[PDB]
Design a protein around this nucleic acid. Structure first.
Length: 88
RNA sequence: UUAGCUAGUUGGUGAGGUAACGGCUCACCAAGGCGACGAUGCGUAGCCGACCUGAGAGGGUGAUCGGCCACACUGGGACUGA
RNA sequence: GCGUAAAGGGCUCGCAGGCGGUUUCUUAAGUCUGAUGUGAAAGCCCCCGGCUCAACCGGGGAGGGUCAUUGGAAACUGGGGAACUUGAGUGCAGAAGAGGAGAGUGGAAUUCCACGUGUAGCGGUGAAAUGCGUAGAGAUGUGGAGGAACACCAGUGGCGAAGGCGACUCUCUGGUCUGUAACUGACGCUGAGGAGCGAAAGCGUGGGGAGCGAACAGGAUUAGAUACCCUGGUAGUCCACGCCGUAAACGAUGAGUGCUAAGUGUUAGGGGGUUUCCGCCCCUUAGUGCUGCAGCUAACGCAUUAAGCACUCCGCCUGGGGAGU
RNA sequence: GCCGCCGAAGGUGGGACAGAUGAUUGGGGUGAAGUCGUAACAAGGUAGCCGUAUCGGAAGGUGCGGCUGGAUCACCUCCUU
RNA sequence: CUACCCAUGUCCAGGGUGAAGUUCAGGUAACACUGAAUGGAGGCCCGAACCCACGCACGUUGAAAAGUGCGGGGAUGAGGU
RNA sequence: CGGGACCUAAGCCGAGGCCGAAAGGCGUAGGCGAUGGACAACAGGUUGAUAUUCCUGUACCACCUCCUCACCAUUUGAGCA
RNA sequence: AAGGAACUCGGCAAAAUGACCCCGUAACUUCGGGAGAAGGGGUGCUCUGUUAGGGUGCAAGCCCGAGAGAGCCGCAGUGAAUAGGCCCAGGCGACUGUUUAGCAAAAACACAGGUCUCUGCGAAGCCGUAAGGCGAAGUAUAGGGGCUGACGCCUGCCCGGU
RNA sequence: UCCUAAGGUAGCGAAAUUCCUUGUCGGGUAAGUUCCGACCCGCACGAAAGGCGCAACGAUCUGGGCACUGUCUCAACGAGA
C-alpha cells in the first residue's frame, strides 16, 4: 500500500494541526498502517527477503518515532499509543 | 576455556542474645535478592606509609623502621578479667 | 596503527551503551576557584646546623587526595522550561531501474524418439585411438516429448545492505534520487551482545533429470600418467520444503558528517538562454568512470567516490613456525 | 551427678576439579645423507590463489563458484596528445 | 485339541510417569520464544485377577501320557477369552 | 424368564442360471443360521422336591367383541394405510 | 557360632532388597530418559487435640486430616503377611511381541524404516480342469514378489561367466 | 613382473570369524587357558547373504565389585510328610 483513501483518509482522520501534513503522530499513523499492510503482504509469500528487510526497517522506524513521541509529550503519547492499538 | 548464584538466602513480624543495630540466632509469614557497572567459581596474594626504576605518565616489590589485620604444633571451645 | 607489511567485522537491523544542530531563562550535577578539617611519624625534594668532611643524624620547611564540610563564577557538558530550522522525517509532484515474491506464456539451440532421403564413413586430435556406423550412421526433411538457459538490445549501463539480479506478461511489495517547498521541530549518528540475510560446494526428504559434469570406465601423450587431451559416465546443477552461515564474501579500504585545484566522460532528474520545433550552452543535483593540484605515504599509489584535512562510534592488529592445530 | 540443644575430629556415600603415570597411537618439531616424485615462484611446463566436495603414495588432480594478487594478446572502454 | 481367518460379545483390581493440545502471564512488529496452570496419549512404569512357561526343587511303574511348590515375564494391547 | 409362531451377521443351503467325462464346483432371487437388534412381572409365602410359574396382592402385553358409551363421515370418504 | 564365594563350568541355590513421605541422584543420550539411578533420614503410642485446613450438613453432627511441640516405653516402631537387590564393563539384537504344544523363548522370527522389481486394472500374482472369487466396492503416494532390518555415518571395485 | 572382467576401498580385526594359540603387551588378581584394552600373522573380516558405532529394552550370553548368606571350611540341631 498504502491506498490514497488511507493516505489522505488516514491523514484526514488523524490530522494533529489543521494543515499539518507531518506532526509525528501523523507519521506514526501512516507508517504504522503501511507497516501492518506490508506485514500481511509480506506474510502472504514468506520467502521474499527484500520486502522483509523493508518490513524490518519500516517497523523499526515506526518504533523510533513512537519513542520520540513518547519523549515529546507523555499523556498525548499514551493517548496516541492506546488509540492506535500497537506498541502493546 | 567460570552465567549462573543464593533458601537464614531476600524481606517482614515476634522472641532471645551481646557493649550494640542487625537473620546475629530461632518461631511464624512472604518469594525474594545478586549479576555484563562481572555475581559466583578457580587462581594468587597480608594491605598501607613507602622502596626501586622512568623525563613524566606509568611498571615492579611490600625486606629492614613504623600503622593496621591475621596466626601462635593442627583443629574447636570457653573461664579469669575492664 | 588497519589498500598491499599483522589488522576492516561478509552484510544489515536494532536494545543497552558512547556522541550530538542554533537562540534564550534557571541550575551547579560535572568544570574552575577561595576558607576550614584531614592526608601521623620516618622517607623523596628545598633551607640550615651537629659527628675532622661524607655516609649519617637532627631541626626548619615543602609536595602528595574524582577526600570531606563550605563560599563563589555559569563560559562549556548535562538537568529543566521556552523557542527556531538546514539536520532528519511526513506531505505534494516527477523520474527511473535485471531490487524481491508468487502464477502464467513465449521462442532460438542441444539431446532423444517416429518416419521419409541417402551411403560408408561420422567423430575427435598436437598426431592418433577408444566410441558410433551396412541392425542404415553423419548429413537432410517433417513431426512429437522433456529439461535447462534466455543471443540480439548489452555498455569500466541500471538497481540492491551485500551475496547478487537479464526472454515476456500480470498480482503483491520494498527502496532510491529530483523538484518546489505545506507540516514536525533534533524526533539524529554509530552501536558490543541479540535478531536477520548471505555465491558455490555440500546435508535431509520428495519431485525433475535435455545440456554440462567430481568420483568411475576406456583410449591416448610420458620412463611413469591415480593428471593435462579425447570418447563416454554417477552424484550434482533444476524445483519446493528445512539445515548448513564459509570464499580473493575485494575497492584486500567499517559507518556517519563538514571542508579542500581543476578537466573529461555516463546515465537518472531539475532551473535557464534564445529556441513551436529540434539542437546547443550554462547553472544545478544525485549516481558512477577516467585524468590530475594541494595534501598523505615506506614506495606503488589515493586524491571531493581520499588512503587529504578534523570530529562520533564499532570491530580488528602486537614477529614467524608451532597453529586456526 | 543425670538429661536436652548445637558442636570439632572421624566414618560412610555419590559427585566435581586439578596434577602425576599408563600398553599403544595422532599430528608436529629437529637432524643424520636417506628412498619416491617436481606441486609452487617465468604463461614454473595446465596461470595461480580462496571457499567447498570427492579422488589419489604425496606434493596434489578434477568439478563448482569467486578474485587478479594474470604472462599475454585482441575486442574494448576512453586516457595524454 | 491346536495354526490361521471371519462375524459378534465379553474381560482387564489399584496407583504412578507425564507429552501433544489448550488457557494464563511474559515476550516480538506479527511471529518466534519462554515460564506457570490446565491437560491425559502411550505396543509407557509398577503390580493383582488372567495368560504365558525362563530358573530351581519335586515328581518320574507320578496326585498327573507334561503337573505341583517357591520364585519369574506380559498385564490397554501385535492383548486374554 | 431362555428359545420358536420376529429380523439379520461371517457362513451354509439354494428354483432357475454358469462351468466340468460322470459324481459335482459356484452362484442370482430366496431362505436358514445368535454370540447381536427388538421384546409385556413383580414382592412375599410355600414343600420331604418346583418358582421373577403354584398361591396371595397388584400389574403389564397383544388379539377379538355376544356388551356399553364417546367422536367422525357416507366415496364432494371416516379410516386402514 | 567364626569366616563369608574359598564350593561350583557358573553366586545354581538359598540368604538379601523392598510400603509411603522427604532429601538427594552421576557418566551417557535419540534430549523423552537413564532414574524406584546411586546413597540416605523419618514412621509405634499419649497429650496439645471435637488440632491447621478441607468434604458434608441449618446447627447438632459426623467423616478426611497434614504439620508440628512436649512425653512414653521397648533390642526392634511399614515390629506380623505380601510388596524391587544393586553397580561397573563387554559381545548380539533397536525396542514391546512371536516360535519349536510335550527338552531348545534365544543372538532365531516378526517389526517400522531402507531398498530392487513387476503390475494401467477382464491386472501383477493367486486357488481353481474350468465357472467363480481373493487382489478390491483398492487403482502406481496402490497392490504382489525379493533382499536387508530402528537411529547415525555410509553402501568401495568387476557385466568375463550365469 | 604373470593373469583376470576386477584384484577388497572405508570401517572393523587373535571377534559367535584365529587352526599354530594360552599369538605379543598392558589393565583387572596374590594367582586370570575366560574377561577389558590395543598392536595385525585377516589360516579362512568387510559393506544391504550389510560394515561400523549406538542412549532405551532383553526371563539372552560373559567378566568384575558392594551388601548378604549353609553354596563350603565342617557340619549340627529342630518341625511336619
Amino acid at each position: 500500500a498504502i491506498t490514497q483513501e488511507r493516505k489522505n483518509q488516514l491523514i484526514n482522520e488523524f490530522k494533529t494541526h489543521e494543515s499539518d501534513t507531518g506532526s509525528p503522530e501523523v507519521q506514526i499513523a501512516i507508517l504504522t498502517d503501511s507497516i501492518n499492510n506490508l506485514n500481511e503482504h509480506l506474510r502472504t509469500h514468506k520467502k521474499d527477503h527484500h520486502s522483509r528487510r523493508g518490513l524490518l526497517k519500516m517497523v523499526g522506524k515506526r518504533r523510533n518515532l513512537l519513542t520520540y513521541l513518547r519523549n515529546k509529550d507523555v499523556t498525548r503519547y499514551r493517548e496516541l499509543i492506546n488509540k492506535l492499538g500497537l506498541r502493546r
